[PDB]
Amino acid sequence: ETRELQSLAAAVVPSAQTLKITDFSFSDFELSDLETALCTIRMFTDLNLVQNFQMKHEVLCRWILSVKKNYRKNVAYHNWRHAFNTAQCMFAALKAGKIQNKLTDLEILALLIAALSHDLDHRGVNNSYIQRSEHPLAQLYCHSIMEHHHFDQCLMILNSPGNQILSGLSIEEYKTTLKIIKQAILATDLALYIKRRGEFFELIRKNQFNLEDPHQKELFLAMLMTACDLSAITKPWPIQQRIAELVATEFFDQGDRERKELNIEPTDLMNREKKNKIPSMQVGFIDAICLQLYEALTHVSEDCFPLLDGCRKNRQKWQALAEQ
Ligand SMILES: COc1ccc(CNc2nc(N3CCC[C@H]3CO)ncc2C(=O)NCc2ncccn2)cc1Cl
Ligand SMILES: [Mg+2]
Ligand SMILES: [Zn+2]
């Protein structure tokens, strides 16, 4: 195909150990785009997906480049690097967290594709903005608007000539995998996490959680998607500090759009005037959204404790910054 493909396809794919992708503390900051593509190949390979599903090397490389291409390079946070890191956290939870022992390769295939694809064509604004602005997508979908679009994009790329990494699946495996992918991408709508997490937390608290139950299995994969999606909140403080810059940039850029295009005053979360409140806001988000999730996940796998540990340490640093 293109020069990028040729370079990628011919490149040696270093080991997962070399690439550090099993570390919960992994950072992509020193990596070129090409190296993030090699990391992604390594993820598919070491989860046995390439071999078990008979993926051709050129097809996987083209698919990865198609996915990366369909994230926007002018969206500060929801871009290819966020999707790549989400997939890397999924790899680490599966390997270092040993969750791969409890899932089938078909489930893992869907999870990894969904992690990589779950914010495709994100435009730097949230569902509330899409609805309030009367964006065309808001006429197509009533809820989880962007996430429905992310899945549409995901399926378009999976079906593109030369990109069909699922061609080796039988029709029944293909249908099941697409449905898991769709659920997994829709799960990254924080609104759906908030609606469904109470059931997960109570099953865990009562020690009634049963991964053999298909409903609880689907619930767990949704919680795991959220855990990977939010995982910047667990990173070592140098990383977290930098990711926070991007989140704030994207939030405040939406606030500017709401002022200029919708003539409304943005909430504090998206109001650049309130930037000195980011520490207290990070603490609020950790308490409200993050801690119980990483706490619950460790009841599923004790080896996922580094995520919870990392979350607690960032809350300590953010609370110290809030106290000024
Ligand atoms: C202005 O700048 C910020 C303002 C707030 C925060 C903390 N709040 C979030 N932080 C993240 N991110 C993603 C990566 C880790 C973390 C950044 O550390 N994402 C989403 C939110 C968030 O509040 N969403 C709205 C919402 N909350 C609860 C229920 C429904 N809706 C961080 C920054 Cl930077
Ligand atoms: Mg999203
Ligand atoms: Zn995301």
DSSP 30-64: T--HHHHHHHHHHHHHHTTHHHHTT--HHHHHHHH
Q: For 324, what's the count of Cα atoms within 13 Å in the CB-facing half-sphere?
A: 2
**In 3-state terms, the chain is what percent helix, strand and coil (to 5)?**
70, 0, 30
Q: How far apart are the first and last CA of the chain?
A: 54
Burial of 114 (0-12, 13-18, 19+ CB in 10 A): buried
Ligand 1 atom closest to 274 (CA): 1
Cα(72)–Cα(77) distance, integer angstroms:
10
Cα(75)–Cα(11) distance, integer angstroms:
29
Cα dist from 280 to 194, 229, 277, 309, 324, whole Å: 21, 21, 6, 19, 10
How was this structure obtained? X-ray
Q: For 166, what's the count of Cα atoms within 13 Å in the CB-facing half-sphere?
A: 26
Find the ligand nearest to 249 CA: 1
Cβ atoms of 306 and 25 closer than 8 Å: yes
Is ligand 1 within 6 A of the CB of residue 278?
Answer: yes
Cβ atoms of 269 and 68 closer than 8 Å: no
- Domain range for residue 228? 1-324
CA of 78 to the centre of ligand 3 (A): 6
Cα(258)–Cα(255) distance, integer angstroms:
5
Q: What does the block give as tokens for 15?
A: 């080991």
Cα(273)–Cα(36) distance, integer angstroms:
35
CA of 324 to the centre of ligand 2 (A): 31
Q: What does the block give as tokens for 181?
A: 């992918």
Total domains present in the chain: 1
Catalytic residues: 78
Which residue bears the tokens 């962007």?
146
Question: HEC states along 113-151?
Answer: HHHHHCCCCCCCCCHHHHHHCCCHHHHHCCCCHHHHHHH
Q: What H or E segment, with its residue span, contains residue 260?
A: helix 237-262
Identity of the amino acid at 135 = H
Could you give the angle at the alpha carbon of 136 between the alpha carbons of 134 and 139, nearest 5°? 80
Find the ligand nearest to 317 CA: 1
Cβ atoms of 167 and 148 closer than 8 Å: no
Cα(235)–Cα(82) distance, integer angstroms:
13
Cα(109)–Cα(122) distance, integer angstroms:
23
Cα(158)–Cα(59) distance, integer angstroms:
10
- The residue to mutate among 256, 271, 282, having the most atoms of ligand 1 within 8 angstroms of its beta carbon, is 282
Q: What does the block give as tokens for 42?
A: 């390594």
Q: What are the two backbone dihedrals, phi and then psi, of residue 201, each rounded to the nearest 5 degrees?
A: -65, -40
Q: Is 12 helix (H, G, I), strand (E, B) or coil?
A: coil
Cα(318)–Cα(313) distance, integer angstroms:
9
82 is in an annotated binding site: yes
- The residue to mutate among 89, 144, 234, 247, having the most atoms of ligand 1 within 8 angstroms of its beta carbon, is 247
Q: Measuring from atom 1 of ligand 1, which residue has the nearest CA?
A: 248
* Tally of CB atoms within 10 A around 275: 12
Conformation bin of residue 164: beta by default, left when phi > 0, alpha when psi is -120 to 50: beta
Cβ atoms of 301 and 98 closer than 8 Å: yes
Question: Nearest to residue 240, comparing CAs of 85, 37, 16?
Answer: 85
